Design a protein around this nucleic acid. Structure first.
Lengths: 44, 286, 95, 243, 173
RNA sequence: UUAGAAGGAUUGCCGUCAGGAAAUUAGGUGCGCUUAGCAGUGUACCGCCGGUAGGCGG
């Protein structure tokens, strides 16, 4: 293409199959206390 | 005063496209017949002796133009852009640009090469489980767009609605039937011998070329009376078949959006069509 | 006559340039200039009177890979064959 | 009286006299502009009638005859005489830029300079080879080298009692400054002393005068005169400058 | 002369629409008429390798009115433009075909059936040497009439400025 | 032209000796990403007239 003007490159583009019509996204979160979340503090 | 365009600016697509598949069928029995079109090893694809109908299937997501912003580093530029879009979606219903895109889907330019010897070619477009009447493709020519057919008015109006922002989305599913002849050759897209592109095992066309075909609506370029042919809509008007830019530095989008938002000016509607036609793509930065 | 007609001896033609081209890269500022007198004298090597139709010259040792614009260095490649060897020197030396 | 710039590109001087008394290395600039007056003297010996007014020096590559020791201080090398008087030598890949004004400047006078310069020596050094002699139109038409400008303002605005002290202080502040030889100061009134090179010229005992110069890059230099050397002769103070 | 325009920017390159759209139908029209006509590439451009062009021009010395080109090219309108005027002019270059020898195998059979017994390398020199120069010229594919083969013809300027014709519409010896 | 000239050079046993090493907390935070036409027609075949010269028909 052309941009800000005064050989092809490889790109990846995932798509849904022809039969499927729904994307499932799976993740998780660990919720942890704020108090026991100090990893390094240099003054009591 | 909006003295300059922002450092980061991008518009998302509003004509999102599937990687188009291929299928081999027979015209006589086509609604109850489908066979995979393998690439069949310089890779070169061809139809079976019995099957004589290419069955290209592609889908089209139409999204509104306002909620296609993706990066903007000046809110002043943003409100002005939205206001300019509102200016247009009120004056026009975006039907002209819609009619153009849908005409490209109605005259088989998506079939870039696989349309030479098609005796009868039928394009069926379905939205929202509503099969529409047949679009015969050889009747509509590929230079002058048409504006007085009722069904193409129907789908175009729907596309204009979602484009304007009335609808948040609009999925389009097209099956095109090409009677290319018994044991003839179909031409899928190429990917970097002659390396043929495979989609789900079967062959098919790259989504980019298909979107390039649905984008060829530019008839308001300056040097038109001379060429008198629609060209694909990029920023500088660079048709690769001719080889020269068709908008150097006069009607370029860069200059045109520097005369629409950068400097308040009521553009002609022929040039306002192009500025929003570009908006369908992206990469307009500094 | 001076023309690489045979494609069998071709692989030597890439290998000699790659052997004297490996780790021999030279920025354009230090490369030899493409004087027209060298292709003029190589046309006067055997008849011709111009560059022959469909054959066109190639520095066996890539200019970029420290080549000279001499008579004993240049050659005539076919156009499709020149495409093969220029894809070879594009891939091998990573221009 | 058209004025043109003639570039002599990649002149390889071998064994130029690097020794200039207190300065060893860069030769006296009077050598490099007496090359211009010799190249004009032999051209007006022919029917060319060129008067060269200024010459700019671009020092592209250098090598000093000698060896580096363990510490870093060089040791200069000299030919064996046929008692060795103090002497040292340098090879210089340097390019000249000649401001030339006269009847006309053309490619045929570039061919005449091409013929004439192959019987000349620069600072007592033979010419091995030359790349090209071309008329230039702008600073872009000059290859990547480093011109020798006269940074006399650094020597003038330098802390010290005497000007030598100022030069020692100047070389201890900026490193790209090099002390260069420019001209000859009179030591006696002129006259016909006996034993001359050419008896008819008036003769004057002299002493080399010295200054501090700098190296300026090719595409960083502003203007062309800013890098062109010229001859000026005040009464008893012969010297080449940059003005 | 009658100018047939390749419509640009319509998809495919001009040479495939030259190869399978105009040349095939012209071949039939040219051979069925006993008065022969001619094919000219006004936009012929030999830069490195040929590039036929964007125009073809059909040329002769009333017979062009008997060619009836309005109705023999009505199936490729969305592809080929038929200029209705038949004007005459002198700014023409006529075109000849350059033989590409034959595949080594083809020649080998021919040169073994009625020729010498031992024949090796020198064909692999002669065929290859002539072909490279020939193959770089502009090429048109044509489907066969009675042999069923894909003939890639090779076209080149002649400058003869007047002459006879072949059934393909080119110069012949 | 700090102008004007120059043979540094013949020759060599660098070798014997060895404990580097003992101790540690890298690390805590993050939008990559908006858009993109691959081919000179894939590039050619099969026979004919003849001393491995040239051509020709489809």
């Amino acid at each position: 293409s052309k941009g800000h003007e005064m050989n092809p490159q490889k790109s990846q583009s995932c798509t849904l199959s022809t039969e499927c019509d729904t994307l499932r996204i799976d993740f998780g979160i660990k919720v942890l206390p704020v108090k026991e979340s100090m990893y390094s503090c240099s003054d009591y | 005063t909006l003295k300059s365009r922002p450092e980061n600016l991008s518009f998302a697509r509003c004509l999102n496209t599937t990687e188009a598949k291929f299928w081999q069928t027979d015209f006589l029995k086509r609604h109850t017949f489908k066979l995979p079109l393998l690439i069949t090893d310089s890779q070169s694809c061809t139809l079976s002796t019995e099957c004589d109908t290419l069955r290209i299937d592609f889908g089209i997501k139409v999204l509104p133009v306002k909620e296609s912003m993706y990066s903007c580093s000046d809110y002043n530029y943003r409100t002005a852009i939205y206001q300019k879009i509102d200016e247009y979606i009120a004056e026009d219903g975006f039907l002209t640009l819609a009619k153009r895109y849908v005409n490209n889907i109605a005259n088989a330019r998506f079939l870039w090469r696989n349309r030479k010897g098609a005796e009868i070619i039928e394009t069926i477009v379905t939205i929202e489980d509503k099969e529409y009447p047949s679009f015969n493709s050889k009747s509509f020519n590929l230079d002058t767009f048409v504006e007085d057919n009722a069904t193409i008015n129907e789908i175009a109006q729907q596309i204009a609605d979602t484009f304007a922002g009335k609808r948040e989305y609009l999925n389009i599913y097209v099956t095109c039937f090409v009677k290319i002849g018994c044991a003839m050759e179909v031409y899928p897209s190429q990917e970097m011998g002659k390396k043929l592109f495979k989609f789900e095992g079967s062959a098919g066309m790259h989504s980019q070329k298909i979107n390039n075909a649905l984008r060829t609506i530019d008839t308001w370029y300056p040097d038109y009376t001379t060429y008198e042919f629609p060209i694909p809509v990029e920023n500088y008007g660079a048709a690769r078949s001719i080889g020269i830019p068709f908008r150097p530095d006069t009607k370029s989008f860069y200059k045109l959006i520097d005369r629409m938002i950068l400097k308040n000016e009521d553009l002609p509607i022929e040039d306002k069509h192009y500025v929003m036609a570009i908006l369908i793509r992206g990469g307009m930065f500094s | 006559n001076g023309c690489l007609i045979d494609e069998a001896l071709l692989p030597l033609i890439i290998d000699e340039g790659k052997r004297k081209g490996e780790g021999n890269y030279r920025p354009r500022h230090l490369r030899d200039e493409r004087k027209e007198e060298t292709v003029q004298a190589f046309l006067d090597k055997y008849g011709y009177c111009n560059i022959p139709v469909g054959y066109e010259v190639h520095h066996i040792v890539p200019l970029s890979q420290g080549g000279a614009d001499s008579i004993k260095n240049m050659i005539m490649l076919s156009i499709e064959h020149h495409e093969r060897v220029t894809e070879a020197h594009a891939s091998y030396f990573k221009w | 009286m058209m004025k043109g710039y003639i570039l002599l590109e990649k002149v390889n001087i071998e064994n130029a006299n690097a020794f200039n008394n207190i300065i060893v290395g860069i030769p006296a600039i009077t050598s490099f502009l007496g090359f211009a007056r010799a190249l004009e003297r032999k051209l007006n010996a022919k029917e060319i009638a060129i008067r060269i007014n200024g010459v700019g020096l671009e020092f592209h590559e250098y090598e000093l005859k000698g060896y580096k020791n363990k510490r870093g201080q060089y040791v200069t090398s000299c030919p064996l005489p046929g008692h060795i008087m103090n002497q040292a030598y340098i090879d210089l890949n340097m390019s000249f830029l000649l401001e030339v004004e006269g009847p006309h400047v053309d490619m045929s006078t570039c061919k005449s300079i091409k013929s004439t310069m192959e019987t000349l020596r620069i600072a007592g050094g033979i010419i091995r080879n030359y790349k090209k002699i071309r008329l230039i139109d702008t600073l872009a038409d000059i290859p990547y080298g480093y011109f020798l400008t006269l940074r006399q303002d650094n020597l003038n605005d330098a802390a010290g009692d005497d000007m030598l002290d100022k030069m020692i202080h100047a070389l201890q502040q900026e490193d790209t400054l090099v002390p260069i030889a420019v001209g000859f100061k009179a030591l006696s009134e002129v006259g016909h002393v006996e034993g001359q090179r050419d008896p008819e010229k008036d003769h004057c005992f002299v002493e080399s005068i010295f200054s501090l110069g700098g190296f300026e890059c090719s595409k960083i230099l502003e203007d062309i005169n800013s890098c062109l050397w010229r001859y000026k002769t005040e009464e008893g103070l012969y010297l080449c400058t940059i003005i | 002369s009658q100018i047939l325009i390749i419509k640009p920017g319509t998809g495919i390159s001009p040479n495939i629409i030259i190869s399978e759209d105009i040349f095939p139908v012209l071949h039939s029209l040219f051979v069925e008429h006993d008065k022969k006509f001619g094919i000219t590439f006004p936009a012929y451009s030999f830069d490195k390798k040929g590039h036929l062009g964007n125009i073809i021009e059909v040329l002769s010395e009333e017979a062009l009115a008997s060619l009836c080109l309005e109705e023999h090219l009505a199936e490729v309108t969305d592809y080929v433009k038929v200029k209705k005027e038949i004007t005459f002019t002198d700014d023409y270059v006529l075109f000849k075909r350059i033989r590409e020898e034959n595949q080594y195998e083809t020649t080998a059979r021919r040169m073994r059936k009625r020729g010498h017994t031992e024949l090796g390398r020198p064909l692999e020199m002669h065929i290859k040497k002539k072909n490279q120069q020939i193959f770089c010229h502009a090429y048109i594919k044509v489907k066969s009439a009675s042999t069923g083969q894909s003939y890639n013809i090779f076209l080149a300027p002649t400058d003869i400025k007047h002459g006879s014709f072949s059934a393909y519409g080119l110069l012949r010896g």
